[PDB]
Amino acid sequence: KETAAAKFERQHMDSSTSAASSSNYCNQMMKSRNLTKDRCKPVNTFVHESLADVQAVCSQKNVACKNGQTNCYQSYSTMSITDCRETGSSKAPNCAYKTTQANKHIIVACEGNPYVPVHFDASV
């Protein structure tokens, strides 16, 4: 199947655009990245920075993930991101999302060889 590194890219990377370009960015992305199939994923964040920059975060500031895992890292620089929050109404596959473009530090879990992001934990 899909490697954890690849899943992270499909669920969280959007390097090809610098930021969201409308309030419908999240409705569009959650659907095309297949995050609404069986259930409207409640929250999801996309990072608008190069893959090289996001991967570099794994050798940046090591912090504990929200579940306590020791392999999370917080980015030193802020990054352009878009937060997607599922609303009320909607029932899969007819999901609806609130789009929020922002610039924040991201926290991701890393692992493997190469040691790369495998989980998006949060933004600060």
UniProtKB/Swiss-Prot annotation:
Q: Which residues bind substrate?
A: K7, R10, K41, P42, V43, N44, T45, K66, R85
Residues carrying covalently attached carbohydrate according to the record: K1, K7, N34, K37, K41
Top EC class for this record: lyase
What keywords would UniProt list here? Disulfide bond, Endonuclease, Glycation, Glycoprotein, Hydrolase, Lyase, Nuclease, Secreted, Signal
Which GO terms label this protein's molecular function in UniProt?
A: lyase activity; nucleic acid binding; ribonuclease A activity; RNA nuclease activity
Task: Identify one Gene Ontology CC term for this UniProt entry.
Answer: extracellular region
Name the catalytic site residues: H12, H119
Q: What is its EC number?
A: 4.6.1.18
Q: Which GO terms describe its biological process?
A: defense response to Gram-positive bacterium
Subcellular location, record wording: Secreted
**Tissues and organs where the protein is expressed, per its UniProt entry:** Pancreas.
UniProt subunit comment:
Interacts with and forms tight 1:1 complexes with RNH1. Dimerization of two such complexes may occur. Interaction with RNH1 inhibits this protein. Monomer.
Q: What does this protein do?
A: Endonuclease that catalyzes the cleavage of RNA on the 3' side of pyrimidine nucleotides. Acts on single-stranded and double-stranded RNA.
The protein in question is named Ribonuclease pancreatic
- The organism named in the record is Bos taurus (Bovine)
* Whole sequence portion shown: 27 to 150 of 150
